[PDB]
Amino acid sequence: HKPEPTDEEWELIKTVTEAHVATNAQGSHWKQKRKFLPEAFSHFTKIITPAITRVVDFAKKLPMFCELPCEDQIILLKGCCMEIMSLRAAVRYDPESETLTLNGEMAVTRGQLKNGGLGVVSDAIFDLGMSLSSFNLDDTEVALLQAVLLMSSDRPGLACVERIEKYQDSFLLAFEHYINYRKHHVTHFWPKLLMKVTDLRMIGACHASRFLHMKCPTELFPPLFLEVF
Amino acid sequence: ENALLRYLLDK
Ligand SMILES: CCOc1nc(C(=O)NCC(=O)O)c(O)c2ccc(Oc3c(C)cc(C(=O)c4cc(F)cc(OC)c4)cc3C)cc12
Structure with a gap:
């Protein structure tokens, strides 16, 4: 009954899906190339720059992103x-090792990411x-x-606010129609997914808080990390 | 500023 994706939405789903798969570290081989960190500014310093770069590559493969000034x-990627x-x-x-995997290779624990420098944001990402x-x-x-977080019109300093809001609405409709098609065995799946978008938005602004607190002279921070704050 | 971000985007 609930609306399933249109042809134009299936094309947008192909573009965004492939863009993600092509920029997702060790997509197939992440779980079998996992190295569990011993027991960390150092080891998390090394891997941040390639993680930012992959996000840049994801956006650069979305045609709608490329039509923006x-x-x-710059502002959308910072955000x-x-x-x-x-x-x-x-x-x-x-859930069995209670680890996250960073860069497809580094499995970390709640404690390691917390004491590694992320602080309480570590608890938010694990939860x-x-x-x-x-x-x-x-x-x-x-x-x-990811497309929904990228196309956020409330980022400060944005010029084409209306265009970005229009792009996001395309993704959100495609996303909801895909969720209808997928028929997940969870109640109120779409409302609950939008709450996760808020959880990631809260994580994005706490990273920004922790960043200003972590300032260690600036030249210790990798250059690209400083640019995206 | 944003010289490195600018570079990575315009590649
Ligand atoms: C999941 C939360 O976000 C993160 N995700 C990934 C990732 O790969 N995700 C999965 C995927 O993309 O597939 C990472 O790799 C991450 C690495 C580091 C990170 O948080 C730090 C930490 C922990 C340290 C510094 C630093 O480089 C630093 C430098 C200083 F000079 C002082 C300092 O003070 C603590 C910190 C800088 C960041 C972003 C957060 C990451």
């Missing part, structure tokens, strides 16, 4: 980068990972969640 692209990386770690939550188990999100659902 450079200064809007969603930690949100998208957090989501990507959270969907790689292993999101635990909640996202029973949601059983596929590559397409993760990609659309």
Whole structure:
């Protein structure tokens, strides 16, 4: 009964899904190439830059993103980068080892990510990972969640606010219609998914708080990390 | 600023 995706929505789903799969670290081989961190600014310093770069590559493969002016692209990436990386770690939550996987390789514990420098944001990302188990999100659902965070019109300083809001509405309709098609065995699935979008948005602004607190002189922070704050 | 971000985007 509930509306299933249109042809134009299936094309948008193909584009965004493939863009995610092509920029998701060790997509197939993440669980079998996992190295469990011993027992960490150092080891988390090394892996942040490639994680930002993958998010940049994801956005650069969305045609709608590429039609925006450079200064809007910069602001949109600043806004969603930690949100998208957090989501990507959270969907790689292993409930048996109670680890997240970063960069497809590094499995970390709640304690390691917390004392590694993230602080209470570590607890938020792990708690999101635990909640996202029973949601059983596929590559397409993760990609659309990412497109929705990327196309956020309330980022300060944005020029094409109206265009970005229009792009987001396309993704949200495609996303809801895919969720109808997918028929998850969870009640109020779509309302509950939008609450997760808020959880990632809260994680994005707490990263920004923790960042200002972590300032250690600035030259210790990797250059690209400083740019996306 | 944002020189490195700018570079990675315009590639
Ligand atoms: C899941 C939360 O977001 C994150 N996600 C991923 C990731 O790969 N996600 C999965 C995927 O993309 O597939 C990462 O790799 C992450 C690495 C580090 C990280 O948080 C730090 C930490 C822990 C340290 C520094 C630093 O480089 C630093 C430098 C200093 F000079 C001082 C300092 O003070 C603590 C910290 C900088 C960041 C972003 C957060 C990550």
